[PDB]
Amino acid sequence: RSFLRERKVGIPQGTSISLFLANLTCWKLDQDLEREGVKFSRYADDTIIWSQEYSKICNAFNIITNFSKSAGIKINPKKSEGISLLTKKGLPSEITSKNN
Amino acid sequence: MKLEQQIQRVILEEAKALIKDYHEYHNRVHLESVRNKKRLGDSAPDKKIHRPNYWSFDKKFDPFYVKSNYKSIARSIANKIENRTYLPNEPFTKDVPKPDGGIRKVSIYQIPDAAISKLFFNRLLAKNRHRFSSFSYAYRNDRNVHFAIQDISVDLKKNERTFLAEFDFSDFFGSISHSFLNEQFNENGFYISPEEKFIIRSFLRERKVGIPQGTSISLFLANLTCWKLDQDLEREGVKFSRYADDTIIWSQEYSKICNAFNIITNFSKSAGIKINPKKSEGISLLTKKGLPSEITSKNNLDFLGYTLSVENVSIKEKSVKKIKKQISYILYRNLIQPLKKTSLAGQTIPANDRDKNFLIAICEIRRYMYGGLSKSQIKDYLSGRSNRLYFKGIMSFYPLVNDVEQLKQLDGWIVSVIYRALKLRCQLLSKWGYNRSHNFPFILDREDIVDKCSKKTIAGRKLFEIPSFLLIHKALQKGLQESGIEKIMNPQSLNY
Amino acid sequence: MKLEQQIQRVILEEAKALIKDYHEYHNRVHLESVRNKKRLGDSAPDKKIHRPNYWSFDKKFDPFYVKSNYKSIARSIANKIENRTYLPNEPFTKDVPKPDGGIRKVSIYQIPDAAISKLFFNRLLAKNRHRFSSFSYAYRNDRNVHFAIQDISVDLKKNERTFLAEFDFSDFFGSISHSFLNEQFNENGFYISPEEKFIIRSFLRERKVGIPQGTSISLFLANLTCWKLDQDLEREGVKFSRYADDTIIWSQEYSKICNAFNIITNFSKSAGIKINPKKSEGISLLTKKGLPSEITSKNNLDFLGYTLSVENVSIKEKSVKKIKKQISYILYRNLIQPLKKTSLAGQTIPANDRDKNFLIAICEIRRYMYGGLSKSQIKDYLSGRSNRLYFKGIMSFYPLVNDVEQLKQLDGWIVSVIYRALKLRCQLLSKWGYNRSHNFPFILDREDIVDKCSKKTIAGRKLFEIPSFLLIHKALQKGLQESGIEKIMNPQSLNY
RNA sequence: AAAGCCGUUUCAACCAAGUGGUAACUUACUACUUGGGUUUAUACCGUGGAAAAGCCUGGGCUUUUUUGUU
RNA sequence: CAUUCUCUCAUAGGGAUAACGGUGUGGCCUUCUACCUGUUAUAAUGGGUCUUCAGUUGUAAUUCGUUGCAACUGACGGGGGGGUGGUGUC
DNA sequence: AAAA
DNA sequence: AAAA
DNA sequence: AAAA
Ligand SMILES: Nc1ncnc2c1ncn2[C@H]1C[C@H](O)[C@@H](COP(=O)(O)OP(=O)(O)OP(=O)(O)O)O1
Ligand SMILES: Nc1ncnc2c1ncn2[C@H]1C[C@H](O)[C@@H](COP(=O)(O)OP(=O)(O)OP(=O)(O)O)O1
Numbered sequence A: 001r002s003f004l005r006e007r008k009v010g011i012p013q014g015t016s017i018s019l020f021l022a023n024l025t026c027w028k029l030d031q032d033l034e035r036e037g038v039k040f041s042r043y044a045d046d047t048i049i050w051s052q053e054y055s056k057i058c059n060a061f062n063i064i065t066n067f068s069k070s071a072g073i074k075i076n077p078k079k080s081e082g083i084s085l086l087t088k089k090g091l092p093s094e095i096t097s098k099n100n
Numbered sequence B, C: 001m002k003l004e005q006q007i008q009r010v011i012l013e014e015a016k017a018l019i020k021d022y023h024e025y026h027n028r029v030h031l032e033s034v035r036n037k038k039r040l041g042d043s044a045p046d047k048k049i050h051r052p053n054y055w056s057f058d059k060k061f062d063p064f065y066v067k068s069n070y071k072s073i074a075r076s077i078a079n080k081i082e083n084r085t086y087l088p089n090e091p092f093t094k095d096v097p098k099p100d101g102g103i104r105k106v107s108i109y110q111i112p113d114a115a116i117s118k119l120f121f122n123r124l125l126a127k128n129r130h131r132f133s134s135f136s137y138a139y140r141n142d143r144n145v146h147f148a149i150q151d152i153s154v155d156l157k158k159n160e161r162t163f164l165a166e167f168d169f170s171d172f173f174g175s176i177s178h179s180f181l182n183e184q185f186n187e188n189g190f191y192i193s194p195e196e197k198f199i200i201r202s203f204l205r206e207r208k209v210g211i212p213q214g215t216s217i218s219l220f221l222a223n224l225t226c227w228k229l230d231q232d233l234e235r236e237g238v239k240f241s242r243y244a245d246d247t248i249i250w251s252q253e254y255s256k257i258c259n260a261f262n263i264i265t266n267f268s269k270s271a272g273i274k275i276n277p278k279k280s281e282g283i284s285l286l287t288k289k290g291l292p293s294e295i296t297s298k299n300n301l302d303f304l305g306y307t308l309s310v311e312n313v314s315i316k317e318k319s320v321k322k323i324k325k326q327i328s329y330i331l332y333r334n335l336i337q338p339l340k341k342t343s344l345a346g347q348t349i350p351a352n353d354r355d356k357n358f359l360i361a362i363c364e365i366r367r368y369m370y371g372g373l374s375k376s377q378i379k380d381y382l383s384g385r386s387n388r389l390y391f392k393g394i395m396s397f398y399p400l401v402n403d404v405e406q407l408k409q410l411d412g413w414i415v416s417v418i419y420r421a422l423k424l425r426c427q428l429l430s431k432w433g434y435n436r437s438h439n440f441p442f443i444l445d446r447e448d449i450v451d452k453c454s455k456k457t458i459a460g461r462k463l464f465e466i467p468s469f470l471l472i473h474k475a476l477q478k479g480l481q482e483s484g485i486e487k488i489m490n491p492q493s494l495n496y
Numbered sequence D: 001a002a003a004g005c006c007g008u009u010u011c012a013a014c015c016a017a018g019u020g021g022u023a024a025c026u027u028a029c030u031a032c033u034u035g036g037g038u039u040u041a042u043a044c045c046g047u048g049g050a051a052a053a054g055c056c057u058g059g060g061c062u063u064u065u066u067u068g069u070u
Numbered sequence E: 001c002a003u004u005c006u007c008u009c010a011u012a013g014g015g016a017u018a019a020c021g022g023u024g025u026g027g028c029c030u031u032c033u034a035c036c037u038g039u040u041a042u043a044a045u046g047g048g049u050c051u052u053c054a055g056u057u058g059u060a061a062u063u064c065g066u067u068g069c070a071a072c073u074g075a076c077g078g079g080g081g082g083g084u085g086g087u088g089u090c
Numbered sequence F, G, H: 001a002a003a004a
């Protein structure tokens, strides 16, 4: 609480305690994603979720949206690439597709 | 006799309402003719009273004849109904313009038959509306289009990504299979007495498929037809909002929306009302303004005069064009059109910085948009200084619009169009031999029109203030928070 | 001022209603005292008029005092409300009996505060009922218990195997967190004006957790509290019907019902209203009478006076016991109880085959269940010979009962109990020195009671016919067909 | 051989097809009383009045009856 | 073929009737409202001012949800075509 | 072994 | 058509 | 609180 006193929102940048605070902040999101059955890998704000089912990935999108509304951390549409479909090099795809 | 008294009352009320409407029509036609002569001068056309054509087709169409002998008509109708021999007379069908879909067939039933249909529709709705889905907002005394728009807006604002599905039935009223309807009478715990059932079958006897267009009983039949569809959609867990044939379905899951598509297809195959491929947009994905989408995406959708997005509710673009057309035509009619005639005889030429035509145009715009409310009254209501404010204008038909930016653009458009129309009026006056560029209404720049027009005062009132959408929108929001959609649009009576 | 006039009207109407109720009370007490003296003779107790105790607690409790000066009270209330200093006076809380769960605390607010609560509840319900789920049937002017029972009955009859989940909230009114309530005011598109919000907070100021018991604003707050739960249950696709705390959830899938359980648990954790494991029956499986079940099974469910099975709707067993208690007590009071006194002075001993006490008992029984309708009137209505029939009896509280077998058993019980009570009356008369076994009411066998009683005629009317549940049930079914349940059970929109 | 079914006789106010046990109760216990207005006679809550009585004081209090109530 | 009244064989047919219905403006009552300024014995009449929203500041209550008050800050009338200038970048 |  |  |  002492390290958060100067500001009224957000955690300080460039100090160690903020790392633990960031890890602790995204615990409910991690639990929800795990219990959805999707595989994911979060590194600070950068998050990648991949599953074999479209419904699971849509639910993951909804879960991240709910978590953002709960914690007040909106997602920038620029850096966030949305939902895609990772196929092989020449496999036809029915929705937006990327090979890597 | 209980039935005969009811029929007498209904027929008399309907005939008296039609007579009052006709008297209002011809009185306002005379008043507008007087104003037109004061406007167009010697070129004004003569007053022309039109009685509706179908009044000559049959006497029972005439409200005056029905009011003449309504006891006899009601007595005969009751006698025929209780003999199970009653049959409504042939309606007058006209080709109502539907350029969007070609033509549409509307029917004007005779006053006695229309009254009987209204009475039995009221009864059937009263004893069965508790079985109708809460998400069917068409032809009800407890559901409005504004409730549907509020529900859609709230649910869209809750989430960020929604799967939509919009479907319009090709010919909803004209393709209902009568076998399906007669099977639906004993389902969902519907309470239809044998008399009401006989009346319903009587109104369907002339045709072999579909329900008549323009009777009240057809509205209840349409609501009853889509009960299994409503139950299936509810049991799927999707949120929907049906208004007659126009159906919107939205859910957070793709599988639910695909199942909703299948359910609607099955219902259409069961009832014979095929969907319209051109009007139905299909399955989409309603995202925010810049969110990437994996399937066909749209940032906003249209539903009954409202363009709904994720963030805000706005007027439909076609309705905005209608508003622009009406306001611009008011300006053209009161400012430019009189000056385009061959002669200016009998017209008042603006002079001494007093253009009555400009005042008339501004007042008529305020009447169209506000409804006659001065800015002082609206500001008083907003401040809480006053507690009474009446909402009857173009805005009362869109009480739920929360798009302040669109109203700002509309206000700017109004000011700019006023300035340009005034410039054209000045040019025409100069071409007619009158220099008035230095007088009040024309010397104003676009920036100073509102500021100077607010200060201008006539008869101790500010009749020259340019009306603004934002102010009446603030009044609408406060009204909603205090009165509620119903009362707000109560005078509006959207209907349509 | 608009507010002060509204408060005046509401307070005056409430006070006048209470005064009318009191006058009816004491007039009927005097009439029943006269009848009692004609019944018990010299052993009849004297008339005792009770004014309610809390009328002495404070003058504003007294309807007469409030009616004396209601303008002043309304003026002061409006002045305090506009100053945001209004605070309702302390109610009179008593120990209403709840032996099923110990005791229940109810509160009788003062007449002005109760009137204000009723007025603001009416306003809030009017401007917000379109947001309430259609499956919340408690404390509404558009829903009642009978609509819920009809919905449940139809849905259960549609299928054969349904997964149930019955839950009750422990002290639902008295455990709602105020933080949750204050957070709910800005959700679901609720339209609550600042005056209404301030009034709501005013009625919650005395306590810290939970809403008061015995005010209309409490009913609105209870309806508003369970909106997120209703939305979640609807979006799960399950069918449910919540009345106050009583919540019946039924679905065709086990997973949906488990998710409904989890949803209710989450809502309880969010609002702090825990579920009592005693009254909550948990998740069951409603099958037919002899269908094997793999989990905990029941063949019928109880919901607010109705025992609902898959095939038919029947009166709740406890309500059947109440009916039996009332009828048997009527017979005992008018036949046996007068004869058990120490002396029979002033009592009319039956003679000449004229037992007036038997006639009085039969008439009172008919009043209890039929409401005073003769079998001739009901048969005339059934045949269609007549179109007017009023439904005010014990069966007007159960219009949707379609269990003919249960009513047949009840009719047999009525006849048998009448016969046995008559036998006991004859025995007591013999013990008192009067042999009457050969006279009209006592010489009758059980088989011949109904026939001879129907044949009996007094004053040109058949006042001796033994009332039957089946006939009034047929009348109720026809009345439901010709008029929505709403009107039939309209005078019975209360509780217990 | 039964169960069962069909009789017939007898006991009971109901709960009770029940209880360790079995009676009581309706201004009770824990939701309603006749199709709507229109006035002869009956009559109610409370307050007035007039009579009587029984107490205090030397006029007041209490209880009954009458009247308006109606 | 009174749109008025009435009769009946009563979704049709008779009778006598000159009114029947309806509109704009005005007066009366009733709501109805902040402030400032004209005229009269203190009320009419005349002319003006402001009202909203968000944030911050400080203050008073709050049953801690919030509310009130005071002061500042900010928002509060579209777009399109042509010419032209400054800024911006190699 | 963990950031400025 | 909501409480006591 | 539906007519067209
Ligand atoms: N203003 C109105 N007046 C009368 N009836 C209307 C009005 N608006 C709608 N309706 C009726 C007649 C319409 O056929 C019906 C709604 O159906 P609509 O939206 O026109 O689609 P539809 O299935 O009839 O297609 P289409 O018009 O191409 O045949 O409601
Ligand atoms: N007369 C009433 N009618 C309707 N609702 C009522 C009434 N009295 C109380 N309520 C509300 C508030 C109470 O919490 C509840 C009464 O139902 P009840 O069966 O007594 O359960 P409960 O909610 O009191 O649970 P518990 O008895 O386990 O504490 O409903």
Ligand SMILES: [Mg+2]
Pocket: B167, B168, B169, B170, B171, B172, B245, B246, B276
């Ligand atoms: Mg369509």
Ligand SMILES: [Mg+2]
Pocket: C168, C169, C170, C171, C172, C245, C246
């Ligand atoms: Mg409960």
Ligand SMILES: [Mg+2]
Pocket: D012, D016
């Ligand atoms: Mg027994």
